[PDB]
Amino acid sequence: WXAXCPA
Amino acid sequence: RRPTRRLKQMHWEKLNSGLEFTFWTGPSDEANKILETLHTS
Amino acid sequence: AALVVDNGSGMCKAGFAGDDAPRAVFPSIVGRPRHQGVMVGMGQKDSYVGDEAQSKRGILTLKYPIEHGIVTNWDDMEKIWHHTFYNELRVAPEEHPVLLTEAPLNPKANREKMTQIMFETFNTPAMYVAIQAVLSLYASGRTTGIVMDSGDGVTHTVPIYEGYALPHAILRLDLAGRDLTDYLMKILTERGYSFTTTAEREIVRDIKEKLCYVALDFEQEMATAASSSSLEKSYELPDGQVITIGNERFRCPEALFQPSFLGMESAGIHETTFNSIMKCDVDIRKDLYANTVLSGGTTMYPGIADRMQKEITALAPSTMKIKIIAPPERKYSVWIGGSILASLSTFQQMWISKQEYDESGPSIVHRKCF
Amino acid sequence: AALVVDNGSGMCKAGFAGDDAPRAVFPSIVGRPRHQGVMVGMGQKDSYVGDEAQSKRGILTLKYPIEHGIVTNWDDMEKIWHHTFYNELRVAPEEHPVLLTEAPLNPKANREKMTQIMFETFNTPAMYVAIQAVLSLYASGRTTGIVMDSGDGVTHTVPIYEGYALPHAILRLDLAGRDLTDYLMKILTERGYSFTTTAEREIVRDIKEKLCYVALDFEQEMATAASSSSLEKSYELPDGQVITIGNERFRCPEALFQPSFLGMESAGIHETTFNSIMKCDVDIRKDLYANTVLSGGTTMYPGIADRMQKEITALAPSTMKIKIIAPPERKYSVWIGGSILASLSTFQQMWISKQEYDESGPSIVHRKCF
Amino acid sequence: LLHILDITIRKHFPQFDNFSPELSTVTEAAKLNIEAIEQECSELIRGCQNLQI
Ligand SMILES: Nc1ncnc2c1ncn2[C@@H]1O[C@H](COP(=O)(O)OP(=O)(O)O)[C@@H](O)[C@H]1O
Ligand SMILES: Nc1ncnc2c1ncn2[C@@H]1O[C@H](COP(=O)(O)OP(=O)(O)O)[C@@H](O)[C@H]1O
Ligand SMILES: [Mg+2]
Ligand SMILES: [Mg+2]
């Protein structure tokens, strides 16, 4: 993702 | 000009008041143009 | 000086009678550490309540003791009240009567439990319990009207008259701040932002309070947001990352007026207010229309006063006049109204004295203070 | 015929509409040689895609273009699709429409770039995007139930009452097969085995696929393994060494029902199913309880269906009956459902024509597909 | 019947193509109650003349 996680 | 076949009949409410007060009585030349255009369009 | 403690789902406000602002306003959460402690000698506590939990919310599982207006955990509720008196207010309830606030259509079990808990664990000399919606109009200075009570629990529309709550005319509504917070993160994932944990739910709540607003026209605003980037605003996460929201600003607060976004068949707060008024008598309908007062933190969105007035005007007959009263202190309207009632000289008559409680028992709360 | 490409985080399946099984099933990995080529006799291609990289995985850095169902690297994704159509399916995309699959609650930019790539690089006549969980229900011959999909990146519960899924009750968790693989190699070091590199990651996945199983009673099984023997299994590594794993057989799959082992506050795969059902209407809850369908490779553990039924029964009211449906071919349920949808005559009007995309650009994928 | 009138006006009567932008005060006037407005103003006169006496 963008904000949060890695994706 | 009348149609050659019977078509859908739309029902209106006749004006109880005299038509002289209404704008329908006034024979403006603009109204005559509508009939001529409709008969040829 | 009688304490005015207003427990709530989101925040609990505590102070003293006669003051114009609560002394302590802290979140109503009870967090516990989910990781084992390795550093010895720190004297770390077992449970953190209030501002301490929020500061260390990264390594805690924040649980709200009150959900949908009903206390699902009566052990954590005692913890918050203990923290309110001894820590935040630093006043022993032994020599100060305590005023509590209920919720509209509250179960009788909660009413007696609140009296029993405080009269024994804290043994306060006196008590009085009042409706939150009733106190909302008292702060505004008018006794007759309809209150659009909204918050982090459940939205209530209580058309009180002569300072008395009408029991049949109260309409419930589950659309609250928590639902919008859960809905905001569901639509924020469309831009690539994933907030899922309870610690990150507090972050989304900060975004909602700062950037979200109510658009006057939904269809007009939707086209403008897509065409131009003027509506986009930037927000900074605690870790330093910068996020951008383009049209979620007016899409999350819009769920209040169109509950079909969340999948709820019930109508919005604009129609619930109109429905509640219709349940009242015809003669008193004129007064309620011109004396409607919003309350709670949910109704603090910019432009909500104008959107509510326009939409309720069409539903109401053209003869009726609409006057949405939105005081700027509506966040603490419940607490301020409680302070006004406590400071009254005639308020001494309907105290629930400790001596009277023992002879009558916990059942006295139903008949004494209603 | 219409190609049905089901891109997945771990493996991608491609085939033809109307067939009962995917034509080509290869891992979705792109590897590049970190070492320097020394010989000139062979081609020594820049990058290897699919099972070609798996055979030579020793000298390559395997990278997954898809993480948690989101395409992180669009340069490598174009390599995989170019490999699917020209090397595995050996067909020209310019003549056959292509059906793709996307996980629910995904960023809008993920499926917007998919439309742009299909219509500009491969020049496919038509395209369509469908939810992975929705197609999993069609493979079971049902149109009313809840699908518990679980793969490498996403574990989403999508309650589907009718032909269209319920959007407001979709729950998605970022805990799937890839997360368990990282946990398996973390607790494998307790026995003295160290798997770190991405090449060694593929070895762990083989161990998980063959030896791991879900225990009916985790607490009772842990005590049984404490007595040693009768539970340790021997696995042979590509080097030649034989490794034995004891309580790690059921500890790794237990992270699904107890995500607290991975440090995630999210609920387990059994509670997230009950929570998803609770968000639906009261009338529909009866049908969803008795028509639970599992899908994906993660739910292929021996005994997961039995364990899931027990957990849901305790949470669900005793009046309702729980029936978990586990089809034997649930690994390819996503593709099989897509084959049925593509072969339908009614679906011919749901295709996105090339001219339609040109007039509206990539943004047409949001309005048409779901 | 009305949908033919749209194509009939557009094809042959360009002057009648769009009259809604030309006349907009009528739509705004449709949101007000004439009798209620007349009664409301009439109340003001009655109150003041009673005040004079
Ligand atoms: N300025 C604001 N704008 C929008 N929402 C707000 C604002 N301030 C508070 N809120 C929302 O209102 C909630 C606070 O509810 P509150 O009124 O304290 O409940 P209670 O009525 O039980 O005390 C918070 O959860 C927050 O999401
Ligand atoms: N027999 C099996 N036992 C346990 N796990 C399996 C088995 N087969 C596949 N898996 C897991 O399922 C994952 C892939 O499942 P699948 O849904 O078919 O692909 P994707 O997740 O890419 O759509 C793999 O990462 C693997 O860990
Ligand atoms: Mg409140
Ligand atoms: Mg999959």
Give the Å distances, CA to CA, from D279 to C97, C243, D56, D210: 42, 30, 48, 36
DSSP state, residue C6: B
Complete DSSP assignment for C158-201: EEEBTTB--STT-EEE---HHHHHHHHHHHHTTTTB---SHHHH
Segments in chain C forming alpha helices (H): 51-55, 74-82, 108-117, 132-140, 177-188, 198-210, 218-227, 269-279, 285-289, 304-315, 333-342, 354-360, 364-368
Whole-number Å distance between alpha carbons of C89 and C86 = 6
Q: Maximum distance among all alpha carbons in chain B?
A: 35
CB contact under 8 A, E12 and B10: no
Sign of CA pseudo-dihedral D293, D296, D300, D301:
negative
Is D48:D61 a contact under the CB 8 Å cutoff? no
Residue C243 has which token pair? 């996020």
**Physical contact, D and E (3 or more Cβ pairs within 8 A):** no
Q: How many CA atoms lie within 13 A of C270 on its CB side?
A: 21
Residues across chain B: 41
Chain E touched by C318 (CB under 8 Å) = yes
DSSP state, residue C284: T
What radius of gyration, in Å, describes the C-alpha atoms of chain B?
Answer: 14
Give the Å distances, CA to CA, from C33 to C45, C59, C60, C80, C204: 9, 6, 5, 17, 21
Selected residue of D106, D174, D178, D182 to mutate for chain A interface (largest A Cβ count, 10 A): D174
Is D60:D48 a contact under the CB 8 Å cutoff? yes
* SS3 assignment, position D347: helix
CB contact under 8 A, C200 and A4: yes
Residue A1: its chain D contacts at CB < 8 A?
Answer: 68, 70, 107
Segments in chain D forming alpha helices (H): 51-55, 74-83, 108-117, 132-138, 177-188, 198-211, 218-226, 248-257, 271-278, 282-290, 304-315, 333-343, 354-360, 364-368
Instruction: Name the packing angle between helices C304-315 and C269-279 (round to 10°).
Output: 50
Compute the CA torsion angle C54, C55, C56, C61 (nearest 10 deg): 10
Give the Å distances, CA to CA, from D273 to D138, D215, D314, E21: 19, 19, 13, 55
Chain C touched by D166 (CB under 8 Å) = yes
What radius of gyration, in Å, describes the C-alpha atoms of chain D?
Answer: 22
Identify the chains in contact with A, defined as 3+ C-beta pairs within 8 A.
Answer: C, D
Residue C212 has which token pair? 């979200």
Resolution of the entry in angstroms: 3.6
Q: Which residues of D303-319 are buried (b: 16+ CB within 10 A; e: fewer)?
A: ebbebbeebbeeebeee
Residue C346 has which token pair? 């005639």
Segments in C246-327 forming alpha helices (H): 269-279, 285-289, 304-315
Single-letter amino acid code for the residue at D325: I
Give the Å distances, CA to CA, from D71 to C78, D5, D30, D108, D370: 49, 15, 13, 12, 18
CB contact under 8 A, A5 and D68: yes
CB contact under 8 A, C319 and E33: yes
Is C203:D272 a contact under the CB 8 Å cutoff? no
Sign of CA pseudo-dihedral C217, C219, C221, C222:
positive
Compute the CA torsion angle B28, B31, B37, B38 (nearest 10 deg): -160
Q: Which residues of D248-257 are buried (b: 16+ CB within 10 A; e: fewer)?
A: bbbbbbbbbb
Considering only alpha carbons, which residue of chain E is nearest residue C316?
E31
Placement of tokens 């309207």 in the chain:
C333
Whole-number Å distance between alpha carbons of D288 and D137 = 12
Is D135:D362 a contact under the CB 8 Å cutoff? no
Q: Which residues of C214-234 are buried (b: 16+ CB within 10 A; e: fewer)?
A: bbeeeeebeeebeeeeebeee
SS3 content of chain A, % helix, strand, coil (to 5): 0, 15, 85
Segments in E1-53 forming alpha helices (H): 2-12, 25-29, 34-52
Distance C10 CA to ligand 1 centre (A): 7
CB contact under 8 A, D265 and C186: no
Placement of tokens 């360009």 in the chain:
E14
Give the residue from D14, D52, D19 showing the smallest Cα distance to D33.
D52
Q: Which residues of D33-51 are buried (b: 16+ CB within 10 A; e: fewer)?
A: eeeeeeeeeeeeeeebbbe
Q: Strand C145-149 to strand C292-295: parallel, antiparallel, or no bridges (unpaired)?
A: parallel
Give the Å distances, CA to CA, from C210 to C26, C170, C234, D50, D147: 18, 31, 11, 48, 38
| Ligand with minimal distance to D152 CA | 2
Give the Å distances, CA to CA, from C329 to C232, C303, D13: 29, 16, 60
Whole-number Å distance between alpha carbons of C307 and D161 = 35
Is D270:D299 a contact under the CB 8 Å cutoff? no
Whole-number Å distance between alpha carbons of C322 and C309 = 7
Residues 6+ away with beta carbon under 8 Å from D39: none
What are the contacts of C160-169 at 24+ separation with CB within 8 A? C160/C133, C160/C134, C161/C280, C161/C284, C161/C288, C163/C134, C163/C137, C163/C138, C164/C134, C165/C104, C165/C131, C165/C133, C165/C134, C166/C280, C167/C105, C168/C279, C169/C276, C169/C279, C169/C280
Nearest to D109 among C192, C194, C196 (CB): C192
Nearest to C61 among D106, D108, D265 (CB): D265
Residue D69: its chain A contacts at CB < 8 A?
Answer: 7
* SS3 assignment, position C145: strand
Q: Strand C324-325 to strand C292-295: parallel, antiparallel, or no bridges (unpaired)?
A: parallel
Complete DSSP assignment for B1-41: ---SS--PPP-----SS-TTTSTTS---HHHHHHHHHHHH-
- Quick one: which H or E segment has residue C56? none
Q: How many CA atoms lie within 13 A of C216 on its CB side?
A: 4
Residues 6+ away with beta carbon under 8 Å from C53: C27, C29, C30, C31, C60, C62
Compute the CA torsion angle C351, C357, C360, C362 (nearest 10 deg): 100
Is C295:C258 a contact under the CB 8 Å cutoff? no
